[PDB]
Protein: Carbonic anhydrase 12
Organism: Homo sapiens
Amino acid sequence: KWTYFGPDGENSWSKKYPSCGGLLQSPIDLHSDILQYDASLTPLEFQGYNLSANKQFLLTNNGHSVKLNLPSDMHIQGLQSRYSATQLHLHWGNPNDPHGSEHTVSGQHFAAELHIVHYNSDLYPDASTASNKSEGLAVLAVLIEMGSFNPSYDKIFSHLQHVKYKGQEAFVPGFNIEELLPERTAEYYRYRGSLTTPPCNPTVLWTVFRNPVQISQEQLLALETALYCTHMDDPSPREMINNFRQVQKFDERLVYTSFSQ
Amino acid sequence: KWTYFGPDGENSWSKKYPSCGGLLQSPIDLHSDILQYDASLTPLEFQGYNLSANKQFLLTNNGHSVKLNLPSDMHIQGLQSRYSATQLHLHWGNPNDPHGSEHTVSGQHFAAELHIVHYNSDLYPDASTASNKSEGLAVLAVLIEMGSFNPSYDKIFSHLQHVKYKGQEAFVPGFNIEELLPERTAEYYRYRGSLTTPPCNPTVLWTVFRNPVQISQEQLLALETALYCTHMDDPSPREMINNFRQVQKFDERLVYTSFS
Ligand SMILES: NS(=O)(=O)c1c(F)c(F)c(S(=O)(=O)CCO)c(N[C@H](c2ccccc2)[C@@H](O)c2ccccc2)c1F
Ligand SMILES: NS(=O)(=O)c1c(F)c(F)c(S(=O)(=O)CCO)c(N[C@H](c2ccccc2)[C@@H](O)c2ccccc2)c1F
Ligand SMILES: [Zn+2]
Ligand SMILES: [Zn+2]
């Protein structure tokens, strides 16, 4: 029953979830004073991201975001263990303020943000298990700006009217998940942080791509108006809007960049 | 009890200070989407700010910031009620990231921020009593950026070495506090918000001046490096740095401006 607004919003999460008050918290503002080029940040390789269109993947409204489950044959290579996909999901603002990314860059929000969550499959049986373990999770973040219509993102957004309420599930045909990543994936920011939602475990290796992708105002409006945090039958409905955490103090941490300029 | 760093950090203030998780929380990002000109916002008059240089004013390190006590004959004229001064203090970052203002403008931090705290002395007997009441407090905020040396800020900063550790105090001779305000104080942002420190009571009328002041790079480094959060005999000393709150969500609300 944590939320992003009101008595149970983010400044209260630590009452029930201690790690949300702990160190290494995400998201953060990416700005020059805390950036440092690291030449060892070589390009990631995205394996098994081309999901078959004849197969289907479960989309669920979990009351906090909408998530698409991903198969464990989908992996990122380049890290010092292989990390296998578990789910992707989004964070966004609202129709009157389409500025709901979690990470900011030099103090500016982007319209939305996509997270593709992976767990260390070398060392762990599943994501739940990896989630409280050192080195356990790797999340890829794509910053989303308002711009051109994006047919790849529409492969997810076209199914939102079927997961409007908490607990609802729908199937999305497979598509190539790499189509959701931006240009020049070799350029990214990398840092040690946390889940941006309760329980806020400080166990995530973040990669935020330097370049945003674009989706249209109509696509953002659909995302911002389609979904509810509450069940279909709840007499106290709550729109699922502004589901991003404020940026966190950078307790002496640097962010490492694969790009020098 | 509470700190700006670590386990007792701002995300955990709401356990012991429930208003830290409530409504109307400050500080906020001031950005053009939420700005609205309001002609009712006339210039404030700063009365009694020219402090007798024959009086001394106590400077304290309280483990959270450095604060100067101010006399209640010092007040703002221009609001509904008279608001009388109680103290001023500052918030800053650290030398590796010297951007520690509380408010932000179009998503940008300034180097530091000075707050001159006042309380409604028409309605209440002192600031302690006003701090949790309707209309209780008014704070003036001055954004600070690095630039020219500022002699007026140096009337405070030259005493910092005598308040290095928590609980230390020094005496500061009266000077004209208006010298700490920026150019064109008629230009400001105004909104209802809260204390930015526990107990975070939503009882502050904010006035954030549009224009920043400048202090030199040496002045700013002095403020970032002179002080500790800890007592002198603490075997584990903590530097006093990054003593600002993160910006709060501020949705379906306006900040009013005295300028268009
Ligand atoms: N933004 S974030 O990337 O930091 C994030 C979220 F924003 C987010 F909304 C979720 S959520 O599952 O979609 C709804 C809130 O739990 C998860 N889901 C968690 C998760 C999924 C897969 C693998 C690890 C973690 C979460 O539900 C969870 C937490 C702890 C243990 C198991 C699962 C998550 F990681
Ligand atoms: N940053 S702020 O402008 O919003 C603010 C105020 F608005 C404010 F009114 C005060 S206060 O005058 O001391 C409250 C009356 O006791 C403090 N002082 C803090 C405080 C003490 C007791 C009760 C409430 C708040 C004190 O903790 C402090 C002093 C200096 C710098 C940071 C914190 C303060 F930080
Ligand atoms: Zn996320
Ligand atoms: Zn203050």
Remarks:
- The helical segments of chain B are 13-16, 127-130, 151-157, 217-225.
